Design a protein around this nucleic acid. Structure first.
Lengths: 135, 82, 82, 69, 70, 78, 134, 75, 65
RNA sequence: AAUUUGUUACAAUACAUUUUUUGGCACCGCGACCCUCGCACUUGUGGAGUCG
């Protein structure tokens, strides 16, 4: 069940509680959404890598709950319950982002995980639903 | 008599359009209303010293369109016939 | 006749929001509307373009100077459209 | 086509918010289908009255917010 | 007794000046219509009371007009 | 997006909309007008202060055509 | 079927279906059709300026500008030039052309109407006389 | 009710000190006497006087000020 | 002929069409303006072959003999 | 073992001078502190004090 153009065209489309598309092993063929969504819900799928996106200027929210994200190739990124294991794997997020959630990922239990994210991704204001504070 | 008619007659033309706010708009006129509301396809919006933004379909309003820059080759007299 | 006009009329009674050309948003019970969006409203707050807010009783607004009107989402349901 | 229903506001003092961030006050005496206003005169908003009665053009009116309830 | 349109009609083949939505003008009136569009000869462009240039034969669009004067 | 002739034929499509003031209304066109006034189903006004996109969700909106500049298609139906 | 045949100065001949009330068939081949006659074969002979056709051709040089059909399949054609053009109906051949004597103007010599009995021919003429051709 | 047209007519009949405001133009005003009347707000006003507004007096002749740029009347 | 315009554009061009609204079809088109962010002084003009024009833009048309 | 005809209804095929399309265009939030533990459908939402 490839993420295909045909798949995207029959997918529930609605205004959420922003314009959101309701959605797989590999992220691909996003061209067909035509950059018309503010949010894309990819929860409960089997994606391994957050990569493969076309240029999408609209896209501001990515809900990627319960997948198998182990590597990273936009204002809000929800990655709860995935497979990121090393602090260094979170490095690509420095190039984006204000709301970040990485709970229920092995990486969470690494020593200094919170401080590492804060220094390497300073643009984040809320991390794991807690305010990044000055201290 | 009417320029509206002339406009209508101009179909499927890849043209630049200029607005009251100066925006240059490169697109194929698929249709135009009786009140000059331009309907373009294969559209390309550029400002008058900054980067470009392209779009598939744009319906621009008649009041906004200052000057429609016509095509290169065009027989005008013929067009002007009723 | 205009379906937006009809919608506006229907919204009579309801609490509509309403911005003008000036950019001064109002919210209030829509008392009366006309073909030209000549709205009257009750119990109406009035935001300034800069920020500050002011309560006021029975505002009238002329549709010419109105920009956009927000109606409650219940009217989406029925039964004007079909 | 239809008349602006301002019969509620007849013979009451109204803040005519007018073009260019200006104001007018005064008691409402009449109007027409173009929303021109005929009103017994008052000040321009510190403050200074001009005229005995005044006529405001339709186009110029932003708003006519009622001073009296 | 004197309405505007008749005054306008009378003032054909005579000197007039026009302000705009701003720059003053000065020229002899050729003809007028119901919409109050103008056609003038010996047009002089008074840029805030400064005759910048003398254009000659001109046609003023109605909506930009402010007032007429001798 | 499809290759339409008119606006009326593309009813209920998610629409980007520009207005003279510079705001951008986005939402599904429920109903059109003789004077291009638009009813929008789920309308979001998106504005840009003199930096980055400020955002406001409005709801069901009647939008006057005087102020409308131009409309663009954001996405397909549903 | 068609219960009414009609001929008009738009140079057409329509075959009508009356119950539904609309044209069953259109015959445009005429270049005003001023006369028709029904063969007593279920067909019609239609006329025009220079060409007399038939309908379920007839050789004509300019005869311009009525028709009558004998039971023997003889097809009469009255002229405005005063010439009486007789035809066979089957062929299209013209076996005779006559010229009437005007009266005691040369413009007034023509044939306005004509008919056969139920072996004789009766032609009203523009000269204020009826003539009987045997 | 007193319509606007009626008011205008009355003013014309009177010949009184009229002070006109300009649409989308704060700094300038006009002051004269109404002579003409039109179907629209346009009128002719002889012996007019242009005024710079208090945030003096300036010379001006006979004028018709166009109906679209009118705002206020008083007479 | 030359045309003055609301947006400070001196349109020197050959007229082809004409109507009630003073919209114009134009050939041999040569506009004149000044792209200039202050303090600066530049005078620019471009040739265009064929060009439609809207009437609200038009302030004053003129004819130089 | 769909086609044609008639009737009824709706939609499409006009114009510039105030309300739309002949334009008046152009040159609460962020530091601090503390209050409230409440079952809803929302302009907005604690309060004192400091910063913008």
């Amino acid at each position: 069940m490839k993420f295909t153009p045909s798949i995207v065209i029959d997918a529930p489309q609605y205004y959420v509680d922003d314009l959101q598309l309701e959605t797989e092993s590999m992220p691909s063929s996003l061209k067909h959404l035509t950059k018309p969504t503010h949010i894309l819900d990819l929860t409960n799928n089997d994606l391994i890598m957050i990569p493969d996106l076309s240029r999408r200027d609209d896209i501001h929210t990515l809900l990627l709950g319960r997948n198998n994200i182990v590597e990273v190739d936009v204002q809000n990124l929800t990655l709860s319950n995935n497979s990121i294991r090393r602090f260094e794997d979170l490095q690509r997020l420095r190039r984006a982002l204000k709301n970040l959630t990485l709970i229920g990922n092995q990486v969470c239990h690494l020593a200094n995980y919170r401080e590492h994210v804060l220094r390497l991704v300073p643009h984040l204001e809320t991390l794991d639903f807690q305010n990044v504070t000055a201290e | 008599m009417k320029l509206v008619n002339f406009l209508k007659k101009l179909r499927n033309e890849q043209v630049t359009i200029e607005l009251k706010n100066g925006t240059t708009v490169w697109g194929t006129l698929q249709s135009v209303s009786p009140q000059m509301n331009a309907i373009l396809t294969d559209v390309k919006l550029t400002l008058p010293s900054d980067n470009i933004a392209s779009l598939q379909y744009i319906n621009i309003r008649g009041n906004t369109i200052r000057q429609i820059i016509l095509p290169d080759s065009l027989n005008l007299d013929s067009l002007l016939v009723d | 006749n205009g379906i937006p006009v009809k919608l506006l009329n229907e919204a009579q009674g309801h609490i509509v929001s309403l911005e003008l050309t000036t950019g001064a948003t109002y919210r209030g019970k829509l008392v009366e509307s006309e073909d030209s969006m000549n709205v009257q409203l009750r119990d109406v707050i009035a935001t300034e373009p800069q920020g500050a807010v002011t309560h006021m009783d029975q505002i009238f607004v002329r549709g010419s100077q109105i920009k956009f009107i927000v109606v409650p989402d219940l009217l989406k349901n029925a039964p004007l459209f079909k | 086509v239809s008349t602006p229903e301002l019969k509620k506001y007849m013979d009451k003092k109204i803040l005519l918010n007018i073009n260019g961030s200006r104001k007018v006050a005064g008691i409402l005496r009449g109007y027409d289908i173009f929303l021109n206003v005929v009103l017994d005169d008052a000040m321009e908003i510190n403050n200074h009255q001009l005229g005995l009665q005044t006529v405001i053009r339709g186009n110029s009116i932003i708003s006519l917010e009622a001073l009296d309830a | 007794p004197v309405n505007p349109k008749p005054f306008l009609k009378g003032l054909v083949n005579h000197r007039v000046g026009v302000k705009l939505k701003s720059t003053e003008y000065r020229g002899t009136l050729v003809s007028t219509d119901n919409y109050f569009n103008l056609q003038l000869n010996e047009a002089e462009e008074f840029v805030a009371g400064v005759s910048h240039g003398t254009l000659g034969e001109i046609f003023i669009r109605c909506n930009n007009v402010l007032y007429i004067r001798e | 997006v499809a290759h339409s002739s008119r606006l009326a034929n593309l009813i209920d499509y998610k629409l980007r909309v520009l207005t003279q003031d510079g705001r951008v209304y986005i939402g599904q066109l429920m109903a059109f007008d003789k004077h291009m006034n638009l009813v929008l189903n789920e309308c979001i006004e998106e504005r840009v202060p003199k930096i980055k996109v400020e955002k406001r969700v409005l709801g069901l909106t009647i939008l006057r055509g005087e102020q409308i500049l131009s409309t663009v298609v954001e996405d397909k139906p549903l | 079927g068609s219960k009414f045949i009609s001929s008009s100065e738009d140079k057409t001949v329509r075959i009508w279906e009356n119950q539904i009330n609309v044209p069953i068939k259109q015959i445009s081949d005429t270049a005003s059709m001023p006369f028709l006659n029904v063969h007593p074969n279920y067909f019609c002979a239609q006329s025009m300026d220079n060409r007399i056709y038939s309908f379920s051709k007839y050789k004509r040089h300019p005869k311009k500008i009525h028709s009558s059909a004998g039971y023997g399949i003889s097809l009469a054609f009255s002229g405005d030039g005063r010439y009486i053009c007789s035809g066979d109906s089957k062929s299209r051949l013209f076996t005779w052309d006559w010229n009437t004597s005007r009266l005691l103007i040369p413009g007034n010599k023509p044939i306005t109407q004509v008919d056969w009995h139920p072996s004789k021919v009766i032609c009203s003429g523009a000269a204020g006389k009826i003539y009987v051709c045997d | 009710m007193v319509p606007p047209i009626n008011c205008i007519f009355n003013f014309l009949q009177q010949q009184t000190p009229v002070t006109i405001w300009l649409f989308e133009q704060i700094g300038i005003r006009i002051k004269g006497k109404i002579v003409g009347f039109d179907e629209f707000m346009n009128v002719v006003i002889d012996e007019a006087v242009e005024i710079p507004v208090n945030s003096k007096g300036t010379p001006l002749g006979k004028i018709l000020l166009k109906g679209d740029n009118i705002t206020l009347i008083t007479s | 002929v030359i045309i003055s315009l609301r947006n400070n554009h001196k349109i020197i061009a050959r007229v082809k069409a004409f109507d009630r609204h003073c919209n114009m079809v134009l050939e041999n088109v040569k506009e004149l303006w000044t792209e200039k962010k202050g303090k600066n002084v530049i005078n620019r003009e471009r040739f265009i072959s064929k060009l439609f024009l809207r009437g609200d833009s038009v302030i004053v048309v003129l004819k130089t003999p």
